[PDB]
Scaffold this active site. Structure first.
Site, PDB file in Angstrom:
ATOM      1  N   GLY A  22       7.357  30.889 -54.092  1.00  0.00           N
ATOM      2  CA  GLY A  22       6.220  31.328 -53.298  1.00  0.00           C
ATOM      3  C   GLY A  22       4.968  30.484 -53.482  1.00  0.00           C
ATOM      4  O   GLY A  22       4.563  30.203 -54.612  1.00  0.00           O
ATOM      5  N   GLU A  23       4.352  30.091 -52.368  1.00  0.00           N
ATOM      6  CA  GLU A  23       3.126  29.281 -52.376  1.00  0.00           C
ATOM      7  C   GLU A  23       1.951  30.076 -52.947  1.00  0.00           C
ATOM      8  O   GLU A  23       2.112  31.245 -53.317  1.00  0.00           O
ATOM      9  CB  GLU A  23       2.797  28.804 -50.958  1.00  0.00           C
ATOM     10  CG  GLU A  23       3.840  27.863 -50.370  1.00  0.00           C
ATOM     11  CD  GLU A  23       3.568  27.498 -48.920  1.00  0.00           C
ATOM     12  OE1 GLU A  23       4.544  27.270 -48.173  1.00  0.00           O
ATOM     13  OE2 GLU A  23       2.382  27.431 -48.524  1.00  0.00           O
ATOM     14  N   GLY A  24       0.774  29.453 -53.021  1.00  0.00           N
ATOM     15  CA  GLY A  24      -0.368  30.165 -53.567  1.00  0.00           C
ATOM     16  C   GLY A  24      -1.744  29.528 -53.599  1.00  0.00           C
ATOM     17  O   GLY A  24      -2.211  28.931 -52.626  1.00  0.00           O
ATOM     18  N   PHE A  26      -3.665  27.038 -55.994  1.00  0.00           N
ATOM     19  CA  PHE A  26      -3.815  25.602 -56.132  1.00  0.00           C
ATOM     20  C   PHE A  26      -2.447  24.945 -56.365  1.00  0.00           C
ATOM     21  O   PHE A  26      -2.284  24.147 -57.290  1.00  0.00           O
ATOM     22  CB  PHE A  26      -4.760  25.305 -57.306  1.00  0.00           C
ATOM     23  N   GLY A  27      -1.467  25.294 -55.533  1.00  0.00           N
ATOM     24  CA  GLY A  27      -0.139  24.722 -55.679  1.00  0.00           C
ATOM     25  C   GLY A  27       0.991  25.683 -55.366  1.00  0.00           C
ATOM     26  O   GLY A  27       0.775  26.730 -54.754  1.00  0.00           O
ATOM     27  N   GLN A  28       2.201  25.326 -55.788  1.00  0.00           N
ATOM     28  CA  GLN A  28       3.370  26.160 -55.548  1.00  0.00           C
ATOM     29  C   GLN A  28       4.311  26.198 -56.740  1.00  0.00           C
ATOM     30  O   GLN A  28       4.357  25.274 -57.549  1.00  0.00           O
ATOM     31  CB  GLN A  28       4.133  25.678 -54.320  1.00  0.00           C
ATOM     32  CG  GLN A  28       4.802  24.333 -54.500  1.00  0.00           C
ATOM     33  CD  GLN A  28       5.789  24.038 -53.396  1.00  0.00           C
ATOM     34  OE1 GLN A  28       6.189  24.934 -52.650  1.00  0.00           O
ATOM     35  NE2 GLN A  28       6.198  22.778 -53.287  1.00  0.00           N
ATOM     36  N   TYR A  97      10.814  32.082 -66.286  1.00  0.00           N
ATOM     37  CA  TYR A  97      11.161  32.730 -65.023  1.00  0.00           C
ATOM     38  C   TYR A  97      11.038  34.255 -65.045  1.00  0.00           C
ATOM     39  O   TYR A  97      11.424  34.905 -66.022  1.00  0.00           O
ATOM     40  CB  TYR A  97      12.590  32.319 -64.645  1.00  0.00           C
ATOM     41  CG  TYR A  97      13.124  32.903 -63.361  1.00  0.00           C
ATOM     42  CD1 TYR A  97      12.425  32.774 -62.163  1.00  0.00           C
ATOM     43  CD2 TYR A  97      14.341  33.579 -63.344  1.00  0.00           C
ATOM     44  CE1 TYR A  97      12.923  33.306 -60.986  1.00  0.00           C
ATOM     45  CE2 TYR A  97      14.848  34.113 -62.170  1.00  0.00           C
ATOM     46  CZ  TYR A  97      14.136  33.978 -60.999  1.00  0.00           C
ATOM     47  OH  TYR A  97      14.631  34.535 -59.845  1.00  0.00           O
ATOM     48  N   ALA A  98      10.492  34.811 -63.963  1.00  0.00           N
ATOM     49  CA  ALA A  98      10.322  36.255 -63.810  1.00  0.00           C
ATOM     50  C   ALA A  98      11.039  36.673 -62.537  1.00  0.00           C
ATOM     51  O   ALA A  98      10.468  36.624 -61.447  1.00  0.00           O
ATOM     52  CB  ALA A  98       8.853  36.614 -63.730  1.00  0.00           C
ATOM     53  N   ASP A 142      -9.221  36.516 -64.510  1.00  0.00           N
ATOM     54  CA  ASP A 142      -8.548  36.798 -63.252  1.00  0.00           C
ATOM     55  C   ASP A 142      -7.394  37.797 -63.393  1.00  0.00           C
ATOM     56  O   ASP A 142      -6.391  37.702 -62.684  1.00  0.00           O
ATOM     57  CB  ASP A 142      -8.063  35.474 -62.646  1.00  0.00           C
ATOM     58  CG  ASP A 142      -7.612  35.610 -61.203  1.00  0.00           C
ATOM     59  OD1 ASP A 142      -6.903  34.703 -60.720  1.00  0.00           O
ATOM     60  OD2 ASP A 142      -7.968  36.611 -60.545  1.00  0.00           O
ATOM     61  N   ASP A 160      -0.895  33.218 -64.673  1.00  0.00           N
ATOM     62  CA  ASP A 160      -1.973  32.482 -64.020  1.00  0.00           C
ATOM     63  C   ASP A 160      -3.223  32.233 -64.854  1.00  0.00           C
ATOM     64  O   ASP A 160      -4.265  32.856 -64.650  1.00  0.00           O
ATOM     65  CB  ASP A 160      -2.299  33.139 -62.669  1.00  0.00           C
ATOM     66  CG  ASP A 160      -1.041  33.395 -61.829  1.00  0.00           C
ATOM     67  OD1 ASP A 160      -1.071  34.259 -60.923  1.00  0.00           O
ATOM     68  OD2 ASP A 160      -0.004  32.739 -62.092  1.00  0.00           O
TER      69      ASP A 160
END
Lengths: 280, 280, 280, 280
Positions: A22-24, A26-28, A97-98, A142, A160
């Site tokens: 999934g994109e987001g 400041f990147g992917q 990984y989640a 955040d 994040d």
């Protein structure tokens, strides 16, 4: 450009990029497979990387995140840094990984079903992660449901660290203008006073709790961010979710005191949540 | 919080939100229907708005965009500002609808098919939009294929004025650090010298041309943004797309001169492209 | 590096540097003599320039000031831009000379003596300068006694446009963090809300008035800037100077309303001050 | 507002403000007398404080400096933090007194007279201070002659930690835009690449050496900061001072290599300077 770190470097050929998680921001992030753990076998991982339209901020954020995850260290309630590809090629930040995705969409899904016991356990884990973070002198800045991922077997992991900071020797008093933090999760001193402390993070935690007890609900429903600036000064706060104890709602309300020092610490949030879990 | 503008205000009840056109940078855009144009009938429009996780930067960018579209004015090659809902409620920026989507995905789609004649016409329109922008003393700072939308009948429209600036009286010499501009589209002075002029925009236009003649191709293929900082200093540039005239490729190469003053103006790009179109 | 402006350029040989008027913020000012006005004779001027330790901010501020003075134009109550040496050599901003120095030290000097009639006339001139500034859509952001110079014959002139801004098409809503403005002269929305309007300037004007009626007195005496952040929220304001009318003190108090819209405009400040001058 | 630090707090009544040592950047320093050292007797000290016109940046810089001096620790070649008055009142940063003033004016004074042996000893001390700083993972970002003070008996002390940074876990890659550092002392990567490392500090050290061997001379004489941006890219460097060995000038030239990794470390600068001192 990027300097080198021998202990964290990982060979580019031992990694196999795959499905995009999934994109987001400041990147992917993309699901990948890595050969190297100490078994030396292929394990599924998550690789954070830049898109073609990356900016210098995007680059500095991603690098900052990698560096933060290194000082933070290892803990069961935060996504751990496994490795990184920095030398000769595109920056690759290898983290764990989640499989279940982020807490928000996760919660909004089961509304099999879910139980209250789970919500309190879920909140307790997060409070534990945040207590560790604080002991490491790191401010996340955040914390939110979208920034918490859940693995298989349901382990809550704070993710994040692009906006996080090292408060070991410097606190950035009157320097942090916090214009890049989502407003509905920001403490008043963060929004108006150019400061950010661990206490600012507890406010955000209270908002995170609300998100949990509303099952992925949107903070300040029916209120646009634009009018929240005045309301917060007036002393406005969110009301009790119809799936929350009166004792739980008091924790939220305590995290939302105008005065930082009057809010509970993460240590207290752990102790009090510990009791509340036993009696459920 | 937001001030009021009588001439641009539009009643919230005359607008009907609909299908989300796609998430993005600092917010999301959704297809909507508005009653008020001077026919006074329901016309399809696009509404730009904030998400729940908006930041103060997101807010200031969206507001900045609305203000920029007002000084820029009306032109056929840029998305025009139709109205805005600022008073009592969530900010809504009402702009014109582009049924075909963005230029990048558009181009990558048809590779019915498309012709070279189209590409030159497509490039000419964009050069015209940019010439107008420059006459209005506005620097876009983010010109790219993804930021150009195409309507029905195929009209090219420059969009996304969140990063644009008013250069009428102030040029921001040594003030613009440009850390939020995508690097593969940035001019060298923008990346290293803390300045940005109309000439910096022509460099980006050259990169936009390359994107067009490669049919939505990714600039600097096989080269990560991280190593582009040194390569650009070495004098590295992109090579000719196998669907471009030798005369067209010279325009690109001219837009990419290290020295700004040696690059062509948008006026020249219009004149020269005008000729090249006739002879096709 | 600096672009060229034919209409404002002035030959380096026609200028003769002299006595240094006093160091400061982002550079220094020195008394000089220029040959060229239209008499074509040697007139005393003031030349603003960088020191050896200048920073990029210093450079961008000085350039910004030169550009602001050009859009502002000509007026009798602001230091006017005479010329500038930008081509081949050190940047030189040529402005008009003020023989008496800055308003603060000026006032603190005569405490021959001075009269109340003078103070009201002095305040009226400044209110007039600020009204013009506002009509030109410029926000000064740093109005204070130290930033007002007085010439021979005692003409009040608003100076130091290094921090000023062009609000013609863009207002910078939620973008101006104002960390470089002196706190004792800042309006609450400037300090906490990331905005700055003409109304923010009237607050500063009120503080400027206090400085005048206290004869170069220091705002918030006995109160350090560090504790002013909380006091301002509590509704604290300065008290009446023992050399001020009760009507004058009400103007100050009006300039200091928490709500911007409730404060008087510069136009009103001019009208009301006009009356008060006649009746003295 | 300011938090509390028991181990560094000092009673306001035991301090006696006196003569102002000289205004400056973001505040002023004044000679004072303090009762408390462990003799418990009155010793002369220097007190750094804010002026009436302080800005939030001024405040955050002064606080940052106090915090940096705490992580840096104790060393004979840097101004040491003695105490601080933060609770209930104006911030007071108590550091050690330097009777001779700053290195620049000091040097320019004696041009009794001074000897070459002194200059090499002077440079060696500074190289030692910088080596310690680097081991503490701190980047000064503003090393210059004006920022080095000399005590009685002539001990060289690096001062002014307002711009310094903690690089322990975070390096700020592509985040430091360095617009507040004086350009004539900045390394190329600092000016153009949005990075700053210990290697960037060695470049500045080379410029500091030049200042010493020219006896308080002004770097890049006859060249304005404005044209230094292009010259530095062309490979321009300063020439040998007519009071410097050929071996010393090679150290300077080594500190000025375009590529950071090719420049000497502070450890090497200490070793090599050690030898050069013995043979004098």
């Amino acid at each position: 450009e990027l300097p080198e770190d021998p202990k964290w470097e990982f060979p580019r050929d031992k990694l196999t990029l795959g499905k995009p998680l999934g994109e987001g921001c400041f990147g992917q992030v993309v699901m990948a497979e890595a050969v190297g753990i100490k078994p030396k076998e292929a394990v599924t991982v998550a690789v954070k990387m830049l898109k073609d339209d990356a900016t210098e901020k995007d680059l500095s954020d991603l690098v900052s995140e990698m560096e933060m995850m290194k000082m933070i260290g290892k803990h069961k309630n935060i996504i751990n840094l496994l490795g990184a590809c920095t030398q000769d090629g595109p920056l690759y930040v290898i983290v764990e990984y989640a499989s279940k995705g982020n807490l928000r969409e996760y919660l909004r899904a089961r509304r099999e079903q879910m139980t209250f016991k789970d919500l309190v356990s879920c909140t307790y884990q997060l409070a534990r992660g945040m207590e560790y973070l604080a002991s490491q002198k790191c401010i996340h800045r955040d914390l939110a449901a979208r920034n918490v991922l859940v693995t298989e077997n349901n382990v809550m992991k704070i993710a994040d660290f692009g906006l996080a900071r090292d408060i070991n020797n410097i606190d950035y008093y009157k320097k942090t203008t916090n214009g890049r933090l989502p407003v509905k999760w920001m403490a008043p001193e963060a929004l108006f006073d150019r400061v950010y402390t661990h206490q600012s993070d507890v406010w955000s935690f209270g908002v995170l709790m609300w998100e949990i007890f509303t099952l992925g609900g949107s903070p300040y429903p029916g209120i646009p961010v634009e009018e929240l600036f005045k309301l917060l000064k007036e002393g406005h706060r969110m009301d009790k979710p119809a799936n929350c104890t009166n004792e739980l709602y008091m924790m939220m309300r305590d995290c939302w005191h105008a005065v930082p020092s009057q809010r509970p610490t993460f240590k207290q949030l752990v102790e009090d949540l510990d009791r509340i879990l036993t009696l459920t």
